[model samples]
Target: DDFLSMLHRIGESKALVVNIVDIFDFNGSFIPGLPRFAADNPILLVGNKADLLPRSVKYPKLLRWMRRMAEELGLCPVDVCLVSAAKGIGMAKVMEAINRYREGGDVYVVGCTNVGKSTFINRIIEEATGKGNVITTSYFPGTTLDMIEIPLESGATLYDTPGIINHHQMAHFVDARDLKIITPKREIHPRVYQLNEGQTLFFGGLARLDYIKGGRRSFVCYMANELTVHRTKLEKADSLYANQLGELLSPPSKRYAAEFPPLVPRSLSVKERKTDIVFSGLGWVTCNDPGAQLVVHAPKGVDVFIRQSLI
Candidate 1:
């Protein structure tokens, strides 16, 4: 309704809808596929937070997966660019893509919250149109709230739209401090866990496990270093988590504990090639071994998923 109202207000406006999405936590923020509502627009995909990934991660693999996934979801993306609003990584490429695709008309920068849409728009505006002049920026409530017009070299205007916030994410389930604990600023230091059969890995109160079987193997976990990953015998896992939550298995403090459910169980059997079992913003579990079995658990409502190895 919001986007449609904007479309109605700016009747017949030729706009390129550029979506800045998080490349690191795609599963957490995206709707698992191209949003059905996005197919009607001429859209481009900007993968933000590229700098937070470890240098070991393969961009080609990530790009290929994103492309395939986009295709599957009916998003015929003209281009997909990776960037980091915080570090300014690949911003030039983003600008170039926008210029090439905008068709001499105004471009509309659109995305959900925390995708760094504001930072990205600010960078583009400062670089492309500031011209040594001071400008003001502010946030207000409502659909299509903020708007900035940039004079194009070809006698047109580029308009950026207000961002819509994604509410399905666990980031909305906690306080400011807890939110920081989930979102990372830099490269994640993967916590490596070597587990024998019948052991489990827990990601805060968000997830849990019971490793049923498979020989002893090493499972490397990539998640926020501040988040804890507790491992124990499958039989003992339940009691330990039940007893240690809030004190040890933290984040959804006791005050907000009822807002979240206890972790649910998930089991995985590793396959060849690198793959990532995502725990949304909390981090991921990456491994290449074909002979590893492990269980995982996360609180209800938080996103937890698996994918082809990012590294």
Candidate 2:
């Protein structure tokens, strides 16, 4: 919760809250700083978008890890439920968990935009609560600027808080059209790249790579299919990145090139099980036996995160 103190203050009231989050992008929306901002309120971590990750990512493993992490932060009733609001998979459990934990109190749903908060709420309201036209969903902002209300049987009402816009998030910087080009709605298709001891992989001009010292290894990337991943020798990575950002590794099409700022570099080491290298809101890369040397390049203002493994 280290990064969530500021967010926690925005909704300090102790409402029976369930955090509808993207299971595939948990590292981006929560984990990176959730430990530091651990709240005592009865919070249930609902993992939405269970249908989007590839079969390699074990949901059970992710859930177990989240359970352990949640307990460490003293956030109890630490239940983890997998749900795909779009596909309507495992949403019943989400509702049951909320009812059990909140016990008819007002429920507060919160998360950053693009986590599918509105879709999840709409599905729940339609299927479980029998409500219609509940919330609006769109790529641009202002769709949900205020907390919307949902009345319950016991006279209490649930509040859907305005989705916080994390500027450190990748969505904030992207143009509306580019959002579709970068965001994935279905299961991710991974791109595998063979890397020798000195190879590198460049994700747009956003991230860079330098394979330091390792035998031959394969790095499998999980991200939006439209986004490009260009690989080359460690030495020439810089020149190519600077010269061919929008052309080769792109999305910052010429029309909106100015929106993307200079790239920031982050270093990563994949030592254990297959890991998911996340470009925050952009997408993630899942690699098995990835070499030790890695340098991730991302926009200077956004965040880049990593997790044990999504598959």
Candidate 3:
């Protein structure tokens, strides 16, 4: 409701700056109505948190992926940039892209909650005005409740929109403590799991993947380094989750356990040499095998997607 109202208010902006994270949970963070709302404006796809990605991640590949995604969303973005707002890694590039793409009018910065829009804006302000702590930063969602306009030297303004709450993300289903545990604060080191056709891997009780019919292969998990990954035989996964959820499988914390939905299964097959099975808001499992058959089990309402690996 609030988000829709805000979007209506900002409909006349000349440029749409869509901010996203490098370890993007595509299905969850993307606002489905954004492209439609900004149909007439030039789009700038800004990928934030680039510093959190492994150093091996290539910028060309990431940009290519963003371009394809924007096309699929029916948006032909004028520019795609990668930046780390916290570290100020690519702020200059982002500013250049915005200046080049934006018309002589206001620019609207938009994205779903927890996508680092505020942090990215803060970094831009600091760089432009040589100031610090301009905007308040918080881990909890919905911090920016109203539109904030920052004036530019050229007389145009940058309007930071309140992030739209995305209930489909796993973050909305957990407590603050559990959220800190699941959200990565540093560079992610991929965890490799070697499994045969009958093994199962659990991502801190939040999501699970069963090797249903694949040959002995490796599944590289890209998640918070603080989060734990537990493995077991596929046949024992059910009883183990039922008996030990919150104890060994952990997370949903005891306070939110009752509200946690049952893990629904989604069968997936990978035809690409490297594919990432993304568990919305949690992280992803990168399977190296081209013909791997797997079954992912995630909480109901949390979206899941299969895409070519970013790294």
Candidate 4:
């Protein structure tokens, strides 16, 4: 009753939907009404931050997975492509795909707040009209104008929506200054850890995983390389945070640690190999072998869940 009813406010207009999403985020939990809008329009799904994913991950398979996920959400996109607007890779291809699918009318660019939509939009502003600072490029979600419109070369206006803030993302929980430390800027070099059952690994004090069952296994962490990860006995974890969180396992880093929300735990069990324990906005941990039980703890309110592995 609450979520789906108000979406008729989107004017019920005809347009091509350029659905942008973070490549690393398996789910961007829709703002509701998306499937219905998509059903009535041509959807061109664009997965951004291609440069952030490890280079070895298969592109064709990745695109297939992207397509499958979109279809699962009932978007039924005409096509999908991966791009890194930050690195300027795949920009031309994105334009090509957008042009091919649009056919006519206006295009609405929609995405979750931190999916780098601003950068993606700014890149188009530069590449499309050969300009810069037509507006500020470096800005956050809540700080900007409502919905800005830009005219494309084809005479169809591309509208950029102020992305909806995902309450479940860890980005909302961290301090602004610390964001630079957690958001990955380059290709992730996954850090692997050999953990025995009963051990625990902490991701920069903001998130953690306790290995509760099964044999010793490799837990590969996909997070910002600048973020530090510390491992120890599950027993040590309780006291470790009590006495030394800010200094050793950091980035609630001293000053911000006091106001930071405490970590809340979520028990998880992997039924199959190559499953990922995703800590929402923070990256995920890949459990290499099956039957490995886990307890994921992250800042209170940040979503912790599982997905099939991307790497």
| TM-score top scorer | 3
The model with the greater lDDT, 1 or 2, is 1
Question: Candidate 4 regions off by >4 Å?
Answer: 1-11, 26-29, 36-39, 67-76, 131-145, 163-166
**Model 1 alpha-carbon drift over 4 Å, by segment:** 7-14, 31-40, 132-144
lDDT of each: 0.68, 0.67, 0.76, 0.75
Cα RMSD to the true fold for all candidates: 3.1, 5.0, 3.8, 4.2
Q: Write the residue-wise lDDT of candidate 4 on 1-311 in tens digits.
A: 32223233343665788878876654643444677745677778888888878765778867987788677766787888889979989999998888777777778787777787889988877665664324323322333436667776555777777666454566766778887898887888988888898998888888889999898788888888999888889988899988777788788778776777888888888998777787766777888778988888987656687767776
Query: On residues 1-311, what C-alpha lDDT tens digit does candidate 1 reach at each position?
Result: 55555544443454676877777555545533234554555677888888778778888887887777566666677888889888898988878888888877767676767778888877867776556443334322233466666666766666666666465656666667777877776797767777777777777766665556767666677777777667677787778767776667777666666676656666677666566777765667776666556666765666566678878
Cand. 4 TM to true fold: 0.84
Query: How many residue pairs clash (N, CA or C atoms closer than 3 angstroms) in each of the candidate models, in the order given?
Result: 8, 14, 0, 0
Q: TM-score-based ranking, best first?
A: 3, 1, 4, 2
How much is 159 displaced in model 4, in angstroms?
Answer: 1.7
What TM-score does candidate 1 get on C-alpha atoms?
0.86
Q: What's the lDDT for residue 29 in model 4?
A: 39
With a 3 Å backbone cut-off (N, CA, C), the pairs that clash in candidate 3 are none
Where model 2 places Cα greater than 4 Å from the true spot, the runs are: 1-13, 31-38, 67-77, 128-145
**Positional deviation of 276 in candidate 3, in angstroms?**
1.9
Could you tell me which residue pairs clash in candidate 1? 206-298, 206-299, 207-297, 207-298, 208-296, 208-297, 274-309, 275-309
